[PDB]
Amino acid sequence: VASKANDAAGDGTTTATVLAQAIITEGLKAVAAGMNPMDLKRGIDKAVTAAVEELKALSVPCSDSKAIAQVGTIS
């Protein structure tokens, strides 16, 4: 995850890693509760396809020099 995140945008690799550790922790806990892992997956994926649409909706264009300097700086 950490690696692909990087080939993709060259940033957010830590975030990615943090999310994965988190999906895994929680998911495995639910597998121990006796849930069906293939469904836990389908749920996770549905949740995500939805999240991505949500993000594309929150996204506002970054086009002025100030905004660009801001992403640069934060990075």
Ligand X SMILES: Nc1ncnc2c1ncn2[C@@H]1O[C@H](COP(=O)(O)OP(=O)(O)O)[C@@H](O)[C@H]1O
Which amino acids are annotated as binding site for ATP, given as ranges? Answer: 11-15
**Listed residue (47, 3, 52) closest to 26, CA to CA:** 47
Residue 23 lies near a copy of itself (rule: CB under 8 A): no
Sign (positive or negative) of CA dihedral 40, 41, 42, 48: positive
Q: Is 13 in the site for ligand X (CB under 6 A)?
A: yes
14-53 footprint of ligand X as x/- string (CB under 6 A) = xx--------------------------------------
Give yes or no for a contact between 20 and 1, defined as CB atoms under 8 angstroms apart. Answer: yes
Q: Which residues bind ligand X (CB under 6 A)?
A: 11-15, 74
